[PDB]
């Protein structure tokens, strides 16, 4: 795993482990939008998944984390403009029970 430089934010704790959402978004002709999930192992951050590749979105999404039923939940919702705001919003939920693998379940708002 060789992830591209990104910023670390949205830190949370699960199963007594520190996790992180790494946002890669430098603008260029060789840089895509990568939304990473990393875990603090010893003294290094280990990238687990690239969450944005598992979506059909074209712009930066709105991200949300919440722990529920011993499970992690990361939401990727389409960013809608304030003037051009649609009556229906789309999100992409990513659950997990172990903290290693994730599944997808696209939802609507």
């Amino acid at each position: 795993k060789n992830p591209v430089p990104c910023i670390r934010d949205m830190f949370f704790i699960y199963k007594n482990e520190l996790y992180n959402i790494c946002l890669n978004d430098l603008k260029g002709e060789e840089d895509e939008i990568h939304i990473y999930v990393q875990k603090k192992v010893k003294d290094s951050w280990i990238t687990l998944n690239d969450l944005f590749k598992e979506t059909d979105l074209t712009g930066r999404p709105h991200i949300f984390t919440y722990i529920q039923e011993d499970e992690i939940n990361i939401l990727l919702c389409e960013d809608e403009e304030f003037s051009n705001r649609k009556k229906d919003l789309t999100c992409h939920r990513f659950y997990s029970n172990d903290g290693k693998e994730f599944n997808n379940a696209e939802i609507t708002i």
Partner: antibody, heavy 126, light 103 residues
Framework: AVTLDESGGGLQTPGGALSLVCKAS????????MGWVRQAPGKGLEYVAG????????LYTPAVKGRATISRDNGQSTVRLQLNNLRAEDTATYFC???????????????????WGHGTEVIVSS | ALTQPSSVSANPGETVKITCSGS???YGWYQQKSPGSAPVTVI????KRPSDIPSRFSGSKSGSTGTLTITGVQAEDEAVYYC?????????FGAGTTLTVLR
């Protein structure tokens, strides 16, 4: 009465540049994404470039990297395409397409096409 | 990539089924009679049909496979049909499927 009126193609010198346009009518132009589709002689369909409903997101086929520029005028309902450094592989018939969504999803540009133009022919030849 | 069969043959009155695999998102179907001629949308957004397309055309999706359906195919339905979708964050089309009416 959705109409898509293309123009701007024809004989083009290799290594030169061209410009296509698409005068759309019959729908709220600002609410949907637009794009161009080409078809080379004896080949299938290929998506060339797409743009969002407002224009903040553009996509291109790998074969036009660094040579294409897609733009739109929501007040004029015109979407254009510009191709520089023309090669013989760009000789094709180009169709202007309208999407059913805004362009927030990749499958909007090729999976939700609800309107096509009548096409225009580009010939890159010396 | 978006995979669809090369050719499909059918007698008139039969139910034809052209499939397209490779994407879990929204499918479209576009009919082209002559090469270089303007294609016409028959099915878009998985199952929507334009108001000028005959009712025998229908669309479907299951998993990562879109399915176009022509119930009781007619002789005038001869054409090549292209499926469009997003193959791994890339706007793409299928290779095209030619419908040859049997005679």
């Amino acid at each position: 009465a959705v109409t898509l009126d293309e123009s701007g193609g024809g004989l083009q010198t290799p290594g030169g540049a061209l410009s296509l346009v698409c005068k759309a009518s019959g729908f709220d132009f600002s609410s949907y994404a637009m794009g161009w589709v080409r078809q080379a002689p004896g080949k299938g369909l290929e998506y060339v470039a797409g743009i969002r409903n407002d224009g903040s997101f553009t996509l291109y086929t790998p074969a036009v990297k660094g040579r294409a520029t897609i733009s739109r005028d929501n007040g004029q309902s015109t979407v254009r395409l510009q191709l520089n450094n023309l090669r013989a592989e760009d000789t094709a018939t180009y169709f202007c397409t309208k999407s059913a969504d805004d362009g927030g999803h990749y499958s909007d540009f090729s999976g939700e096409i609800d309107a096509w133009g009548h096409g225009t022919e580009v010939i890159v030849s010396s | 990539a978006l995979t669809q069969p090369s050719s499909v043959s059918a007698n008139p009155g039969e139910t034809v089924k052209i499939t397209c695999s490779g994407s879990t998102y929204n499918y479209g179907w576009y009919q082209q009679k002559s090469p270089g001629s303007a294609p016409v949308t028959v099915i878009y957004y998985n199952d929507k049909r334009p108001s000028d397309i005959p009712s025998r055309f229908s669309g479907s999706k299951s998993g990562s496979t879109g399915t176009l359906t022509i119930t009781g195919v007619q002789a005038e339905d001869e054409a090549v049909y292209y499926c469009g979708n997003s193959d791994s964050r890339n706007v793409a089309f299928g290779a095209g499927t030619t419908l040859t009416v049997l005679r």
